[PDB]
Every structure is written in C-alpha cells, then in structure tokens.
Design a protein around this ligand. Structure first.
Ligand SMILES: *[C@@H]1O[C@H](CO)[C@@H](O)[C@H](O)[C@H]1NC(C)=O
Ligand SMILES: *[C@@H]1O[C@H](CO)[C@@H](O)[C@H](O)[C@H]1NC(C)=O
Ligand SMILES: *[C@@H]1O[C@H](CO)[C@@H](O)[C@H](O)[C@H]1NC(C)=O
Ligand SMILES: *[C@@H]1O[C@H](CO)[C@@H](O)[C@H](O)[C@H]1NC(C)=O
Ligand SMILES: *[C@@H]1O[C@H](CO)[C@@H](O)[C@H](O)[C@H]1NC(C)=O
Ligand SMILES: *[C@@H]1O[C@H](CO)[C@@H](O)[C@H](O)[C@H]1NC(C)=O
Ligand SMILES: *[C@@H]1O[C@H](CO)[C@@H](O)[C@H](O)[C@H]1NC(C)=O
Ligand SMILES: *[C@@H]1O[C@H](CO)[C@@H](O)[C@H](O)[C@H]1NC(C)=O
Ligand SMILES: *[C@@H]1O[C@H](CO)[C@@H](O)[C@H](O)[C@H]1NC(C)=O
Lengths: 185, 291, 185, 185, 291, 291, 185
C-alpha cells in the first residue's frame, strides 16, 4: 500500500463525483465529454506529459528537454535516496500541476458563491484532497490565500470554463494515479 | 487562459444586473475569422432563452431586445447552426433581474446571561433576486463601533464575538443594520438599547425540593442561578391543573416555608429570575421538576 | 509528583511575579500589603475557606453548612472513587474560585488595554495557568468569552481595584497549593 | 446534522458489512438469520429496551423500573441542561450496551487470531467506531485492555457464538440509530 | 451466558490438536432433557465432516473413530434429524492436525549502517498446520540479553529496536531462535557473530564528477558516505561495455587523478565502501551516475 | 576518537567486576613516548583510591594488589607527579565489587477486577552491588509464554499489558522470575496459579441507602459492582462501636429487608464481594457510607 | 524574536545547567575548565568554524575550502529565498554539528545507565532541545535510534570523555547562539 497512491485514488474518485454533479446541475450549459474541447492549462509550464513515464518506456532521454523545470523538490512521498531522477522530476511536475489547478479552482469557487442562487459550487472535499497530496509531494507546500472579488463576474463564462477544467483535470488525475501505482509496484 | 467563448462574443445593454421592468439589448456578434466553413443561405445564428428560440439572423451580427423579464436568472445562449453539421454553442449571457433591497423594519439585540455574546436579529423583507451583503454595526456612548459583515445571502442573525461589559448599568448603546446590492442600499433606523434591555438572565440551572426536613406540608426549594439577580418567581400551581404562580419571590437562592399541598402527589415545579425589576427581561422557566 | 500540584505551584509563582510587576508599574497608586485592605470577592459564594482542610483538622462536620454549594463536579485532578467527599467538595469550590477570578481579571484587562499608554496589563501567562488548572479540576470547564467595552472607563478606579484583587488572589493561590500538596502526600 | 447520529449511522453500516463477511467466510457454520436464535447479552443489565423511546410513546413512567441503572453519566453527545431525563438515562444505557459488547468482541478476536489459518477475524474499523461513539456518550470512557490467552480454545464454539452476537448487535445498532435521529429532530 | 451448544455436547479424544497420523474419537452426546419431541424409530443423530455423513445412531450417544486425517482443519458437525422437521445443528468440533515444528537451520543478523537496528532472519522450514510462536534472543559477552517474540504465524524477520554499540570492535554476540507449538519445540543452534560481521556499511549517498577542473581526461569524483570507512572501491568500467573496477581506492572521500577516457561520452559510475577490510561486508553499489 | 587516557593505560586483573573477597591487580603502565619531560629521580607515578595514596614507583610500570575491597565502587586514579609541575591525571579504573544475586523466594501474581492487567511481585533479597536485570515469564497450560524484562535495577513489580481471558475458570498458569548479573544467575521456583486465584474482584463502586421507602427501621441497600459475583458481605455494625458484619449476603445487587437500628443516627456502611466462594479473594471494603 | 534563536538560547542554558551538575556529581574525576583539554569531535567534518561568520567579517571567500560539505539543506529556520549562501551553508553545518553530538551523547547515556548507582546521567531535557533545534534546521531530520549494549563498559573512561565533550559542546552552543542573534538582527 502506498499512502500517496491512496491520496491519488481518493483524488480520481473525488473528481469523478464532482464531474457527475456538474453535468446534473448545469443541464443547459454543455458539459458532455463530446461537446467540451480538451484544453490543458499546464500545456507548456510542466513536463508531467514527458517525465512521468515507466522507466522501461523512457530510454533516449533526448525528449526530456534540457531538464525542463528540473526543480526536483524533495518530499515525503518518496525518499531522497530511493528512486531515479526520472521519477523525482515527475513528482515535482505533479506537485506543480496540482498548484496550477488549485489556484484556478479557488478563483472559480469565489466567483460562484456570489450567485444569487446556489446552482453549483466546487467540492470542498476535492480541494482538500488536492492540498493533502501536495503537502506529501513537496515539503515547501504553499497554501493558496482566501480569494475574493469586490465586483460580480458574468456567471455563464465561469460555468463554461469550469466544465472545460473539470474534464481536463480528471485526465490529469488518472495520470497521477498510474504513476503512484508504478511507484508502489 | 482557458477561453469560454472562441467563435463569437455576446454583449448585454445596459448590464447583466437590471432593475425589475427594464429591457436588455442582448446582441450576439461573430468574429470575422470564425464562421460557417461553407457560405450558404441556409446557415443561421439562433439565440435561445432556456433553449427556446427568440431570434435568427444569417448575418454575423444578431440584435435582440427582450422585455418583461421576471425576477430570476435567464440564460440566453447564442448557437450557430450550419448547413449539415450540428449546432455549435458559441457564447451566452446569464441575466439576473433584481429590485432595490428591503430595509430591515425591526432590529433587536439579545445577550444570553450575564456572560454572553450579543446577537442582533432583523426582518430582511422581500428577497431581491441578487447577492445580498448585510453589515451590523454597534456604537456605544463614545463613538467607537464594532464592524461585522454577514456575507451569507440569508442571515438569521449576526453575533458579536466580544462580550459587552457595561461601564455603568445605565448606558446607551445604538445598533444599525445596512443591506447593499448591485442596484441599491437600505439602512435600518438606529435603535438605542440600555445594557439591562440587552441582557436576559439564564433560566435557573439548579433545583432541589425539601419538605422543611420533615413530613410537614411546608416545602423548601433550593435552586441556584446567576449571581446578580434582585428578584425571582416560583410556580406553586398544582400539577393536575395549573392555578396561579407567585409574581415575585424574595432574593433567596433557597426558598423557605413555601405553602405546599399536604398530599405527596407529584407536583411540577418551574422557576424564573429577573436581573432587574425596572428594565430586565424575565428568565425562561427552568426544566419542570416532577414531585 | 502531582500534575495539579505542579499547576498550582505554577499559579502561585505566576501571581508572585505579576504582583511584583504591579508594585513597580503603579508607583503612586498604593499597592503595598500594608496600605491595601483584604477584600475577598468569593467571601460567601464558595466554601473553600471551610471545605479545604486536612482530614485531621475537620471533625465535627457541623461547620460545613448544609453541604453548601455541594456540586461535587467530577474532574481529571482526582479520580471519582479515589478520595473522601471532604476533598471532592474542596476541588469543586477551588474550581469555582478560579472561575470567579478569571471572569473578573478578563474584564479588568479589557478596560486596561484602552489606556493611551501601556502602564500595566494583566499577564497573559497567569490567565492561561488559571484556565489550565480549571480544565483539570472540572471536565465541564467554561472558557470565558472575549470581553470588550464600547466606551472608556476611569483608569484610576480599575488600577486600585486591580491591586486589591492581586493581593487577595495570591493568598488564595497559597491555599490551593497547600491542598494540592496534601493530595499528593 | 448530529455528530453522534453520524457515528451511529457509521456503526450500523460497519456491522452490516461485517455480517455479510461473516456469512461468506463461515459457509458451513450456520449464520443465516433464520437458523440463528436471538440472544441478547444485555437482557437484564441495561434499560435501553424501555428507556430509549420517543417522548410521545412513554407516558405512565411506571414501566421504568425504579430508575433502573440510573447512572445518568454526563457526556459530549448531549448537553447537561439540554434534554429530559428520559433521553439522559437512554444515552447512559446505550454507553453501557456498547461497553458490554466491545469487551466481549475483543475477547472473541483474541481467540480468533490463534487459528492456524485466518478464516475470519473481527473488523478493526467496527471496533474503533464503537470506541469513538462511547467517548462521545460518556466522558469517563474506559478503554478495554489488550486481551490475550496462554492456551488455544475450541474454534467451532467461538465461530457459533460470534454469529449469534453479530446478528443481535445489528438489531441494537438500528435501535441506537433511531434514538440518534430522534435527538437530531 | 451465551452458549453455542444447547441441545448436546461433543467430545474429542485425545484433543483437537493431534500429531499427524493419530486417530480421534469424536463422540456426540445428547443431554437427556433435549431431544426429538416425538420418540420415533425414524429420527437420527448424524455426524458430518465438511457436511459429509460419517455415522448415524438413533440413540443419544454416538461414537466415531476417524483415522488418516490429513494436515489441516476438519469441521465435524453433529446434527439432529427428526421425523418431519428439518435437521437442527446441535454442536460441532474443529480438529487441527499438526506435526512437530521445524528447527531454523540458518540464522543471520544484519545491521544496516553504523547506526542501524539489528535484524535477524531464519529459514522456518516446513509449515506445521498449527499456531507458531517465534522467540529471538540476543546475548552479549556475559549473559545479558535482549528478547523479542514474533507472535505472527509467518515472520520474514524479527528486528531489535535497540541499536547495538560495541564496547570494543572485536566482541562476541550470540543469537538463537526458538519455535514452540502445541505439539513440540525446536531451537536453532547458537551462532556467534563479531560486531564487524553484523554491521554492513551504507552505499555512499553522495557523488560528484569533475574533470580535475579542466578539459583534461583525468577525472576527480567527490562522494560522501559514513565516516568510519577504511577502504573503498570505484567503477571505472566504460559505460558501453563493463570491463574492470578497481579492487580498492585510497581512504579519500574525494577521488583525485582517476584515469578516465578522453571522450566526453556518458559513463555510468558506481561506488562501494568497506567498513573493515579484515571482517566487514562490502556496501551496495551507489545509484549509477550518468556521464 | 576522544581518548580519556593518553599519557598511559591502567589494567585490572581479573576484571572491574569481581566476587566479594577477591583481590584485583591494578597495574598502571606509561607509554614510552609520554612521560616526565625532564628525567629526574624526584618524579613519581602515584596510584590513589578516592584520592588516597596506595603506591609510588619512579619507573613507568607500577604494580599493585589491593585486597579486602568492600561492596561498592572504588575509583583508583593513577596520577603523574613531575619535579616542579603539578600532578597530571593520566588514567584510572572504576571497580564494582559484587556478590551472586539473591533468588526471589516468593512470587505472587494479582489481577485487579474481571478486566485487569496481571501484575507479579517478588522479594528481591540482598542487593548485589551490580546492575540487575529481572525477567518475568508466564506460561499457560501448554507451553506458550509472555516474555517481559524489568531492566530497571530496582523493580517493585512487572505488569503484563495483555489481560488474561481464561479458556476455562479452572486452568493452571505458571509464573517464574529470573535475576541475572555479571557474576551469576538465580531463578525463582515455578508457582502454578488457577485463574480464580489471580483474579481479585473490585470493591463495589456504587452504594445507596433506603429505609424500605418508609420511616421503618428495616433498610434496603442498593449497590452496584462487577457482574460475575456469586457471593457478597455487608457491614451492619453500629457506627459508634463496631460489632459484627454478616459473613455472606444473597446474590442481590440491592439489599432488601436488612435489620437496621430504629434510631436515625449516622451509621458507617462498608461492602465487599467474592467472585468465587471456593477459590476467590474477597474484594476491598467499599468507601464507608455515612448514615 | 527568532524562534531558532529562542531554541539556541534554551540550548546554551541547558548545557550550562548540565555542566554545573557534572562538576558537582564527579568530585574526583577532573572536570574544571583548566584541567580538561579542548577536543572538538567535529574538527574537520564540518565548516561551522569558517562558514558561520558575520557577512562583514568574511570577504575573500578563498578560505571557504571548495564549498566544503556544501549540502545546503533547506529548512524551517530560514526561508529558501531569504538569506545569502554564507548563512545557508552555516545552518547546514550547525545541523551536522548537532547530529554528531546527539549520536555520541545517546551512546554515553546508554553506557551510564548500566552503573549500579546513578552518580550521573545526561539530561533528557538537553537532548530534547538538540532534537527540536535540528528539526527546525533541516526538514530531513533523522531521529537517532535507541542505543543499548549487551555488556558493561569501564565507567571511568566514559566519565572522563563526558566532561571533555560537555565543555567543548558549551563553546559550540555559544557559537550557534551568536549566529541566531545575527540572523534575527
Ligand atoms: C437597444 O438597441 C436599439 C437598437 O440597437 C435602440 O434603439 C434602443 O434604444 C436600445 N435600448 C437600450 C435599452 O439600450
Ligand atoms: C457620533 O456620531 C454621530 C453620527 O455620526 C454624530 O451625530 C455625533 O455628533 C457623534 N458624536 C461625537 C462625540 O463625535
Ligand atoms: C440615554 O438616552 C435617554 C434618552 O435619549 C436619556 O434619557 C438617558 O439619560 C441616556 N443615558 C445616558 C447615560 O446618557
Ligand atoms: C476410542 O474409543 C474406543 C471405544 O470407545 C476405544 O476402544 C479406543 O481405544 C479409543 N481410542 C482412542 C485413541 O481414544
Ligand atoms: C552464560 O550462559 C551459558 C549458557 O546458559 C553458560 O554456559 C555460561 O556459563 C554462562 N556464563 C556466565 C558467566 O554465567
Ligand atoms: C570470540 O570467540 C572466538 C572463538 O570462540 C575467540 O577466538 C575470540 O577471542 C573471542 N573474542 C572475545 C572478545 O572473547
Ligand atoms: C597479581 O600479580 C602478581 C605479580 O604480578 C602475581 O604474583 C599474582 O598471582 C597476581 N594475582 C592475580 C589475582 O592476578
Ligand atoms: C512444557 O515445558 C516443560 C518445561 O520446559 C516441559 O517439562 C514439558 O514437557 C513441556 N510440555 C510440552 C507439552 O511441551
Ligand atoms: C492443575 O494442577 C492440579 C495439580 O497439579 C490438578 O489437580 C488440576 O487438575 C490441574 N488442572 C488442569 C486443568 O489440568
């Protein structure tokens, strides 16, 4: 049993439940996988797409581009002398992916609360799981400050952006789960 | 930057928030680079409210003037229908029709017990279909005020964490509640309360029944409550039928020589205390004591 | 070693340091034991003066007045089946004495903070020790709510009342310490 | 939402899962509700059967037998001045029921571990839930000491007794859940 | 008192635990008060092993002598069949056939690093079908000792939480493992280990490659490991094909003037250290350093 | 390596630990490189016990044979005195004179209440001036033992954390205590205890006095204790002078129709319970109840 | 106020009290500063003697020998982007100094306990302070395992070595305190 793998399995399950709630709440807003384009915020910032691979799959090492964002932050998920750099870079990039998403999700939630009704709001449990996993991934975890606005934003745009992020995040959550399973075995 | 609307942008005049009765100019505009891949005089640019068609223009610029919108939110989504391909949602607007906020007619502040947190309650009035922010301010004789905001859209009450210790039992403290929404702002009339009015004594927690240490009818009741009580009241009513309860008891924690019925049949007992006779609320009756 | 005795010894030491500070800060205000009358707020409310005695000293039991304020609150300082009622009533009365003083001390501190200068303010450590001892004495401990005023009180009256309370409290602290030593031995 | 009600709902669910496991593990041992007699260990010791009723249902009060086992232990589940004696006696009796079962379940588990194979063993999670609920029910919670034996008992007798207790405990768990729901509403 | 068997009791001779090969006298006896409500010469008292009929007696006393039981547990349940009513299970016995426990042939104790917890490993041997208790005892020169018990039926190893500090580098410490089961007890032969044999140096955690601060072929390797190392070994083998690694390096944390190939092609580097040349195990090779 | 002794080394024959009565050969030897900077026939190599001179040799090799050492530790320090410089301490030895350990004559194991942790107590005997290690082992009917070591030099008792649940009320459990010191090892005789002997019922926690719900002399006492009690005893002795207490009470938690004195004068009440009449210890008397 | 400075001030005070106890307990053993030679175990292993200097004092940087033991372990005492490398190397070296001393002190204490009498034993509070300071200095703190021996060592040699270490450690404790004061101001 791997504790980070348990957190990652909790993350994928939490996103799956939130995604189901989002489809039910926003009946008109189009939130089916077919009608929602895949857009990834972390497209160029992080190297999870390349660094997070089984050791057998990655060989030439040429594609790792000049140790891109090679922070290699030390953390409680692995041990400093336990695994190869290929997994050390991957764990740092996964931490960065969760930081980029959590900062955005909190911004969306703060705008959603202002709605006169409560049609939809991001799951507090899902946000807590993202923070818990980041704390294990990197010791120098930064907790996002409470975000708020002094004005009211258009709600339709936030609800379309929300659906686009949730689906992309779910794909990211499976990718983290596969890496955690590989680390355990 | 995830972009919600890529094919085109839709504008609303004057704004998404409008006063009940106003008319909005929802206008759907398509960027020149985006559009139907094959020009044909069959493709349309529909506008839908709750998925109900309101307008259709072949040209990229579509103009609509919806009227008589009811209180609430209406989703106007502007989709593109091409010749054979299915409709692609392009962009949409959510409109919240609202009205000016109701002023709170009555404001009351109650503190529970000698040691308590002051809590103020107000009548919100009609619900404006808009986000509502409530501010409760308490000012003493000196112009120093505690500021607390109830950001929650519906607030039963707002509680000041700090306990109020009155420099003198007769002081004047004034409380006001302000409600602010995108459309307007309503403030309750200032209400001045003396400390005795705000404080409400706790119901006496303790109760003991003794028949004057004897089989005699006379009964002595040993209860305990908050120290600063200058008055009290006791229920001597027979349990089977309520009769009369004494208006006032002496300033004794322990009742002595109370007139009680000679039988030993079970009798319910209730007790209340008044912090100040001149301007203090009566305490709630204590849990009934059987026999 | 008795943990409550350690808390009581900490209490007496904390009062001794605060009393020394009070005499130094208030040079004109008269705060010497000779010029300050002994006045005890808990004169009639609690039976610590009579109930808290060595078992050998108390015998007739007539003087215990009708089990005065015999709440006998159960607590972590003693065990329910460990000691005689004479010490059970005493521990409850000591808890009540600390509750009466803490509520008053917090009221004085809230008035003292408003002073334009900071000539004197009650020791936060001393207040914390009183709360810690009460938690051990009775499970149903009530934490006093933050107290504040919307006006400014006369400061001379608060500073004379403060000196009268500190000296009386110090005598109470030695009485608690003697009882805790007797319980330990 | 009532926290004790949440613990009681967790208890009923935990027993339901353990009961299903017991039926699957012991295929030959008869563990169907039809073949297992109802036997309650707490038949005369506690008054949960009579004290734990809705206030409307209980009226004559004659059937409460002389305040049987009227310990009325104070606890975090209710407040001391919040509810009528009828519910105060009920909460104490429920605490006693959980204490009688936990002491027995631990004795059975200690005997089950000695088995050369691991056909069945009591769920650690279910035992933890029973302890958590007792801590809320009564402040003076006693944690059962680790139990062990220096010899090996017959296993068939323990496995028949286990099935008899599990079914009876499940009925008790629903009774606790009904009382917790009534307290919440 | 909950009782599992109320209708009748079943006894086993000699006991539920028997040596492989022995024969058990399972005897099902019915209490006189309990029984078939209507006497009839149709009701029977069956005995079943894994629900397979082995015997049937109309009388309350049933006697059986099962033989050739294999290793494992066999559930013999004795049910009552009446004339028309369904069979009621009355009582049963679970029998564990076991054999004498295997003695551990080899015992080895290894401590990881200068600071480590001693861990001892043994070969359990054939698994006796019985609960197994393992005791590990470690004694120093004079007979002081540390003992821990591995109650778990299968134990990979037992670890002494206490660290071992050797009064002198050459000392003798003896370790023994005892296995006890209902049937018998086997104890491993005492094995005497000097502290140097138990200790195993950690692989060097650090590694640095520098080409003598120049473009020259000569390379300097700056690694770090546990302080008490009097020897070391380095891998200078070419990465493409492994060739030879130097048997010993000088007592230097930082290698200097090592012969390295003139090309800058990536080379794998592995490092090991020996705490004592005379009686110390070699450390595991450090994570390969690319180039 | 911090070295306590540099100028010279001192050896002891046979060892620092010796049997009471033995003679130690403390020999102070000086390394050739170290010594008095100026050779002179004035410098000496003294040996001191508790800073008391026992010997003095000009040569580097000093030999002494101390005898009749009492029980305890004696610090023999060997200092160097030069011609004008002050004495420099060179090295020293601490000798612990000890005797063979006493065997524990009596071992008793007591468990408090039906649910309790077994605690065993022994008589250590004469204190050997040496480190003492005590091992307490408890074995059940077959051989399965719990191992616990009291490393503390003085142990009042050793407690087994695991509660003992007896497979049957009549079982035999055997307990032994072993004491080991550098000089020798003494083991207590095995003592066999049945579960009833080990268990001791708790004093009844609850007590209630009721005069049969009347002013009549007869009194009913409502107490509560551990469930498995088959006997009990009550103190009806008059408070002013103790008289007699009934040997046994019926198996009733609530006493009924007890003979009590007609006056209402305060009477002390004490209660005890016996788990088993045949082989169970009496419980301690419950806290006296006044009146 | 600097929390690490408070821990360092606690360390110097704890060593001062332990050193006074050591002199009183070992009356014959020579433990005065005059008769005890200065020997530092961390003479060559760590660069605290050179790296831990005020920024004004260190300039040529030549004397820092090739970034000796330049682990630069990140920690809660400073912030990663807060101070210059000269103080980052110093904090790592101070952590290493405390690790070398704690491992040795625990070894001495384990040998001291075996003594038939209890003439002297290392202060548990002083050891706890060393561990607390190390936890703040470096996130990857390693807790030393309980150390024990299966034989009895000569006690005179341990008591002479103890006095030599205590005096050297006290000088190290003042050096840590000076650095912590410089970081605060
Ligand atoms: C809406 O637009 C029409 C034409 O574009 C204009 O005549 C009318 O005044 C506008 N009304 C508002 C409220 O903007
Ligand atoms: C307090 O505030 C009220 C309203 O702002 C004002 O009328 C009054 O004069 C103020 N009093 C003082 C003393 O400033
Ligand atoms: C409070 O106000 C009332 C009426 O405004 C006045 O009669 C009373 O004297 C005031 N109290 C104080 C303390 O000023
Ligand atoms: C089993 O019982 C039979 C008859 O009761 C007897 O002859 C035989 O010796 C017994 N064998 C054992 C092993 O007890
Ligand atoms: C140590 O124990 C072994 C075996 O029990 C024994 O042979 C030996 O004599 C013992 N040594 C001492 C010094 O007691
Ligand atoms: C350990 O034992 C070996 C052989 O039994 C012996 O040669 C050696 O001297 C012993 N070591 C000690 C320290 O007694
Ligand atoms: C002590 O040494 C002397 C001379 O060196 C020798 O005669 C004697 O036998 C020794 N005694 C012991 C107990 O070693
Ligand atoms: C249990 O141990 C004792 C002493 O070691 C021995 O005499 C006895 O035979 C053993 N019993 C079994 C069943 O091994
Ligand atoms: C325990 O031992 C006694 C005497 O040694 C014996 O009479 C008794 O039967 C034994 N009990 C058991 C259960 O073997």
């Amino acid at each position: 049993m791997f504790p980070c793998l348990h957190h990652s399995q909790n993350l994928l399950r939490a996103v799956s439940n939130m995604l189901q709630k989002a489809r039910q709440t926003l009946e008109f807003y189009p939130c089916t996988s077919e009608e929602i384009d895949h857009e990834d915020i972390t497209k160029d910032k992080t190297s999870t797409v390349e660094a997070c691979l089984p050791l057998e799959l990655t060989k030439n090492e040429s594609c790792l581009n000049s140790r891109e964002t090679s922070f290699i932050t030390n953390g409680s998920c692995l041990a400093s002398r336990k695994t190869s750099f290929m997994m050390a870079l991957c764990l740092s990039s996964i931490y960065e992916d969760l930081k980029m998403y959590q900062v955005e999700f909190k911004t969306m939630n703060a705008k959603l609360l202002m709605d006169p009704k409560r049609q939809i709001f991001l799951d507090q449990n899902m946000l807590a799981v993202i923070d818990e996993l980041m704390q294990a991934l990197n010791f120098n975890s930064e907790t996002v400050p409470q975000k708020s606005s002094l004005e009211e934003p258009d709600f339709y745009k936030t609800k379309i952006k929300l659906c686009i992020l949730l689906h992309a995040f779910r794909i990211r959550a499976v990718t983290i789960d596969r890496v955690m399973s590989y680390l355990n075995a | 930057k995830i972009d919600a609307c890529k094919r085109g942008d839709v504008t609303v005049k004057p704004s998404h928030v409008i006063l009940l009765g106003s008319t909005v100019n929802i206008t759907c505009s398509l960027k020149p680079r985006q559009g139907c891949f094959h020009y044909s005089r069959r493709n349309k640019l529909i506008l839908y409210k709750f998925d109900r068609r309101i307008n259709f223009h072949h040209g990229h610029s579509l103009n609509s003037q919806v009227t008589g919108l009811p209180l609430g939110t209406t989703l106007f989504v502007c989709k593109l229908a091409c010749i054979n391909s299915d409709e692609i949602q392009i962009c949409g607007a959510e409109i919240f029709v609202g009205v000016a906020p109701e002023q709170p007619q009555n404001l009351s502040c109650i503190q529970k017990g000698e040691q308590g947190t002051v809590a103020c309650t107000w009548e919100r009035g009609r619900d404006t279909h808009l986000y509502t922010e409530y501010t409760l301010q308490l000012s003493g004789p000196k112009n120093l005020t505690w500021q607390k905001q109830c950001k929650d859209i519906y607030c039963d009450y707002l509680d000041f964490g700090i306990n109020l210790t009155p420099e003198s039992p007769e002081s004047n403290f004034t409380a006001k509640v302000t409600a602010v929404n995108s459309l307007g702002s309503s403030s309750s009339l200032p209400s001045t309360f003396t400390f005795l009015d705000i404080v409400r004594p706790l119901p006496p927690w303790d109760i003991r029944i003794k028949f004057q240490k004897a089989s005699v009818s006379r009964c002595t009741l040993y209860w305990r409550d908050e120290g600063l009580v200058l008055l009290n009241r006791l229920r001597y009513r027979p349990s089977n039928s309520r009769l009369w309860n004494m208006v006032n008891v002496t300033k004794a924690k322990g009742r002595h020589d109370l007139l009680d019925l000679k039988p030993f049949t079970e009798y319910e007992f209730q007790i209340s205390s008044k912090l100040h006779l001149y301007k203090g609320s009566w305490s709630d009756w204590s849990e009934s004591l059987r026999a």
